[PDB]
Amino acid sequence: DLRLHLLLNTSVTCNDGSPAGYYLKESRGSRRWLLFLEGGWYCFNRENCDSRYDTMRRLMSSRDWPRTRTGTGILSSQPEENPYWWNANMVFIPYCSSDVWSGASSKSEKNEYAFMGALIIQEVVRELLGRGLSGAKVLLLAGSSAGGTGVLLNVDRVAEQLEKLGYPAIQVRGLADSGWFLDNKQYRPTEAIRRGIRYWNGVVPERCRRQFQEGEEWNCFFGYKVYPTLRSPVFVVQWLFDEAQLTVDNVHLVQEGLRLYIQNLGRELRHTLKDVPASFAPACLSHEIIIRSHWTDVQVKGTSLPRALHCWDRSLHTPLKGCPVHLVDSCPWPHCNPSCPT
Numbered sequence: 455d456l457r458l459h460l461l462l463n464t465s466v467t468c469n470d471g472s473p474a475g476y477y478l479k480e481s482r483g484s485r486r487w488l489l490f491l492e493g494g495w496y497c498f499n500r501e502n503c504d505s506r507y508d509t510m511r512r513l514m515s516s517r518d519w520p521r522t523r524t525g526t527g528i529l530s531s532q533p534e535e536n537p538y539w540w541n542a543n544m545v546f547i548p549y550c551s552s553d554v555w556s557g558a559s560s561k562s563e564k565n566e567y568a569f570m571g572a573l574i575i576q577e578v579v580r581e582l583l584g585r586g587l588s589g590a591k592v593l594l595l596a597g598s599s600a601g602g603t604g605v606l607l608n609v610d611r612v613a614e615q616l617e618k619l620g621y622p623a624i625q626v627r628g629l630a631d632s633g634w635f636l637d638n639k640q641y642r643p644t645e646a647i648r649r650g651i652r653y654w655n656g657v658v659p660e661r662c663r664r665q666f667q668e669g670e671e672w673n674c675f676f677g678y679k680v681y682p683t684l685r686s687p688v689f690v691v692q693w694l695f696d697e698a699q700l701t702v703d704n705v706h707l708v709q710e711g712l713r714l715y716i717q718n719l720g721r722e723l724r725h726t727l728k729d730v731p732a733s734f735a736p737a738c739l740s741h742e743i744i745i746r747s748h749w750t751d752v753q754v755k756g757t758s759l760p761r762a763l764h765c766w767d768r769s770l771h772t773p774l775k776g777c778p779v780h781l782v783d784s785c786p787w788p789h790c791n792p793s794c795p796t
């Protein structure tokens with residue numbers, strides 16, 4: 455089990471002003487550290503944040519958090535469940551800022567809610583350095599859904615923070631699961647991100663900000679636009695027919711028009727990954743994520759995700775015999791890969 459620690463700096467807060475925190479399980483015999491960002495949508499104005507506070511309050515407050523959590527999937531310490539990193543130091547960072555991990559605004563007279571996602575990550579890292587992170591050889595910043603987009607937005611800032619604090623030997627890397635979206639034509643919403651950024655005082659990586667310039671920072675929330683600006687190694691996991699992508703596209707499951715739409719979506723996603731050397735993109739319709747216990751079962755071209763991640767580790771010690779890292783399905787319809795989740 456992972457044990458809860460509330461941040462000692464109580465000014466780094468969840469939406470309602472309660473302190474943020476992290477769940478930790480240490481592994482004294484390991485110099486690998488996995489920091490996982492939880493997901494779960496976002497809110498972008500007073501009225502829809504108020505509704506989220508009524509029925510999704512654990513994503514806005516630490517008041518009701520439990521003292522422990524069980525690590526599952528990539529956060530499991532059992533080798534049978536986690537062939538990749540079972541002996542690592544494990545950290546789960548709850549998502550209580552509703553800002554896709556981008557915010558840097560405190561609660562005040564003018565702000566009913568605090569949006570501090572980017573500052574929560576920085577403060578967790580700072581407090582972990584005194585609990586053993588100072589001895590790490592690799593820090594893998596991972597996350598699912600809104601946490602996957604959060605990895606893309608924050609991995610280079612973690613790397614810069616550690617260099618400025620005096621820890622240049624720690625290698626910072628990212629693993630972005632289910633957070634790579636397309637600003638495509640709907641079958642029958644980027645405005646919500648644009649409004650959110652202003653409401654949150656959201657921050658994006660500096661090289662991406664300098665490309666798109668003032669008022670266009672929403673572009674940096676889209677993986678295919680922000681990824682080429684990043685310096686840290688990043689592995690991308692994305693279903694070709696992700697259920698959240700289809701939901702925002704107003705697709706709910708077929709005649710010819712919808713068949714062509716779905717096939718084109720898969721081709722567009724595959725195209726955006728052509729120049730991403732470390733990636734795992736199966737041809738499945740799914741909302742499943744990498745902290746589920748059966749994450750080992752899906753394969754692309756005969757290779758599982760735990761294997762691909764191990765091959766990525768080896769590559770960061772040119773392509774490796776029998777150990778691939780670029781795994782993108784080419785078949786054009788959901789479940790054309792037989793290993794897709796049920």
Ligand SMILES: c1cnc(Oc2ccc(-c3cc[nH]n3)cc2)nc1
Pocket residue numbers: 493494495496554599600601603633635647675676698
């Ligand atoms: C399932 C899927 N997604 C979420 O949260 C997100 C929602 C939208 C974005 C996003 C990024 C660029 N444009 N929209 C990112 C994360 N939560 C559950």
Ligand SMILES: *[C@@H]1O[C@H](CO)[C@@H](O)[C@H](O)[C@H]1NC(C)=O
Pocket residue numbers: 463465466573
């Ligand atoms: C707590 O965090 C805030 C925001 O990063 C920072 O401004 C402040 O200096 C911190 N307090 C202490 C005592 O370090």
